[PDB]
Amino acid sequence: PDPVIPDPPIDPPPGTGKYTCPFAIWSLEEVYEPPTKNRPWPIYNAVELQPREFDVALKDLLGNTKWRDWDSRLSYTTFRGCRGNGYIDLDATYLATDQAMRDQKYDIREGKKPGAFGNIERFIYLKSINAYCSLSDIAAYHADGVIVGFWRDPSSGGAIPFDFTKFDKTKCPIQAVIVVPRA
């Protein structure tokens, strides 16, 4: 008996403009400290890059549907909604956890910044611009940063889970990191 034909994936809509990543972006390639038994990932030295643009307009990602707002960072005031129809925000707080680092359902690197205190932060990889962005920066008090992905998995009728641990970069690749406008 033939194998079952899988349902085809869902593709993101095209972008209608460009949008510069509104937080600092970085290259993490040089190793600062090798993995240890308790920390099975290296720490990199973070090197700053000049700003880059995603190939979507901010308005492409915005609309009138609700953000998941997993970590409640957007709950304190009225924001422009999400475009929805497959676009959705990811949990920037979860992605900075040891758990998210162990799993690498998304590619996340730990790195040491330049500067007085030499802060060690977790950096989400952004394939769209092949560069890294600090989860610390995106989720800072009043930054109003959102990581926007697009749900591609046609399973369960294409429904987006209400459990962020069900997400991964193949099911839901990152499309952009934005500052969501107030409304």
Give the span between the Cα atoms of 68 and 96, in whole angstroms.
17
Residues in the chain: 183
Of 96, 46, 108, the residue nearest 70 (C-alpha): 96
Residues 6+ apart with CB under 8 A from 84: 63, 64, 65, 66
CA distances from 32 to 75, 112, 116, 120 (A): 37, 8, 17, 11
Give the span between the Cα atoms of 131 and 75, in whole angstroms.
29
Residues 6+ apart with CB under 8 A from 73: 92, 93, 139, 144, 145
CA angle 98, 136, 179 (to 5 degrees): 130
Of 71, 31, 94, 67, the residue nearest 149 (C-alpha): 67
CA angle 32, 33, 37 (to 5 degrees): 160
Question: Can you name the residues that pair with 150 across neighbouring β-strands?
Answer: 87
Q: What is the residue whose two structure tokens read 């758990």?
A: 99
Give the span between the Cα atoms of 66 and 169, in whole angstroms.
22
Answer for the pair 147, 90: CB distance below 8 angstroms, yes or no: yes
Residue 28 tokens, joined: 């993490």
Domain spans, the chain:
1-183
Handedness of CA 62, 66, 68, 72 (dihedral sign): positive
